[PDB]
Amino acid sequence: QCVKLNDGHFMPVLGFGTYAPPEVPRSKALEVTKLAIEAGFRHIDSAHLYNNEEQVGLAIRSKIADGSVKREDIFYTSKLWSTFHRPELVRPALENSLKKAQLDYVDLYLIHSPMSLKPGEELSPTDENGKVIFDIVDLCTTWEAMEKCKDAGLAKSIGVSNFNRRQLEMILNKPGLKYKPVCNQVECHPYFNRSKLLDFCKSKDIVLVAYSALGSQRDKRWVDPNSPVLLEDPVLCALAKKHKRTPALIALRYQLQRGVVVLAKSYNEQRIRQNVQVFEFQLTAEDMKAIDGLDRNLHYFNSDSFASHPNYPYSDEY
Ligand SMILES: NC(=O)c1ccc[n+]([C@@H]2O[C@H](COP(=O)([O-])OP(=O)(O)OC[C@H]3O[C@@H](n4cnc5c(N)ncnc54)[C@H](OP(=O)(O)O)[C@@H]3O)[C@@H](O)[C@H]2O)c1
Ligand SMILES: O=c1[nH]oc2cccc(Nc3cc(C(F)(F)F)cc(C(F)(F)F)c3)c12
Numbered sequence: 001q002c003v004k005l006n007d008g009h010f011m012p013v014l015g016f017g018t019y020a021p022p023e024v025p026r027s028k029a030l031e032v033t034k035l036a037i038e039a040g041f042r043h044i045d046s047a048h049l050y051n052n053e054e055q056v057g058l059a060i061r062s063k064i065a066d067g068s069v070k071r072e073d074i075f076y077t078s079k080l081w082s083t084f085h086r087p088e089l090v091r092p093a094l095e096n097s098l099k100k101a102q103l104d105y106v107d108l109y110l111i112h113s114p115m116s117l118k119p120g121e122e123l124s125p126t127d128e129n130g131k132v133i134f135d136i137v138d139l140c141t142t143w144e145a146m147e148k149c150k151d152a153g154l155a156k157s158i159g160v161s162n163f164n165r166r167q168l169e170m171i172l173n174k175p176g177l178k179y180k181p182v183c184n185q186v187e188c189h190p191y192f193n194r195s196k197l198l199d200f201c202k203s204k205d206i207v208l209v210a211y212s213a214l215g216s217q218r219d220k221r222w223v224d225p226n227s228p229v230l231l232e233d234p235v236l237c238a239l240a241k242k243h244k245r246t247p248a249l250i251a252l253r254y255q256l257q258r259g260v261v262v263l264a265k266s267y268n269e270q271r272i273r274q275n276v277q278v279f280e281f282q283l284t285a286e287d288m289k290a291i292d293g294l295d296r297n298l299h300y301f302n303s304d305s306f307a308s309h310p311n312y313p314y315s316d317e318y
């Protein structure tokens with residue numbers, strides 16, 4: 001099952017999340033991405049930030065070489081990291097991502113975050129006192145360079161991630177805009193369901209793509225350990241028992257039924273195989289309303305250190 005993007009391309013509605021923290025050996029990304037394709041995932045979400053594009057690309061090429069899929073059957077996403085927003089850096093960053101993955105094109109290239117950072121080799125450039133160094137970049141010029149990557153055939157579609165309404169409007173209202181973003185990939189789950197942003201995106205022909213749809217990896221470096229564990233929610237657990245599924249499957253199916261494309265990370269073979277069951281059942285309208293009732297404006301990623309960034313996306317209502 002796919003959704004038609006505003007540029008005519010098609011995006012599978014269930015995507016495999018590939019981020020794993022640095023303590024996980026890089027070889028794991030190759031192993032689990034192969035498992036994901038074998039289980040039925042056809043949309044694969046990576047990024048420069050994840051330091052795994054070589055391994056994720058190897059997995060895609062493995063499943064092509066063994067005859068399981070063709071390149072046209074796979075929807076591969078990468079993302080432009082925030083140290084590469086300056087327009088002259090955009091196409092080389094994409095070409096480097098393609099070289100790592102050994103792919104001729106990505107199906108989707110995203111601006112990973114609106115919060116530009118100092119250009120250089122470091123993913124998180126810091127000054128003398130350990131403070132992250134921001135950069136000021138007109139994201140409309142970044143977007144024009146993204147459009148040129150689409151026209152060059154290096155990205156089939158282009159989109160954004162972690163943008164709020166105001167930041168989307170800045171692109172949408174840009175003079176001489178050639179391609180709208182096809183999507184906005186954002187944190188989205190029953191405790192932070194993004195209903196207003198979803199409505200806005202629908203009104204602009206933009207797909208909302210949910211990350212941390214299972215409640216995030218709860219990495220103690222960026223998630224409060226005292227935050228509620230999404231998959232332990234009593235309503236999700238009751239719905240799982242009713243449908244003979246699992247809380248994770250309820251959380252994924254919720255997004256599909258509200259028009260949201262949903263990512264799911266797992267580095268566990270059994271859970272990878274479980275997650276494709278999202279297509280095997282339906283939630284009732286009443287079930288959906290129960291899940292809607294869980295919304296509590298809870299964002300798992302602790303971005304408070306970036307609150308002073310002029311492009312911090314979470315200060316606006318949506
Ligand atoms: N654009 C961005 O800024 C951004 C930010 C965050 C994430 N993302 C993308 O979105 C992907 C997913 O988001 P996420 O990484 O926050 O993780 P997630 O999808 O919310 O999953 C969180 C945890 O759920 C566990 N899990 C998976 N399937 C399960 C199941 N069936 N039952 C129980 N637990 C299950 C996984 O643990 P195991 O691995 O142990 O199964 C995983 O660590 C990322 O990998 C990345 O591709 C993008
Ligand atoms: O993409 C991802 N996959 O797994 C992840 C785990 C943690 C953070 C991620 N992304 C990210 C998003 C933001 C946001 F949302 F605030 F824009 C900021 C930053 C950072 F690190 F720059 F602060 C990183 C990702």
Ligand SMILES: [Cl-]
Pocket residue numbers: 048049050051052
């Ligand atoms: Cl990298």
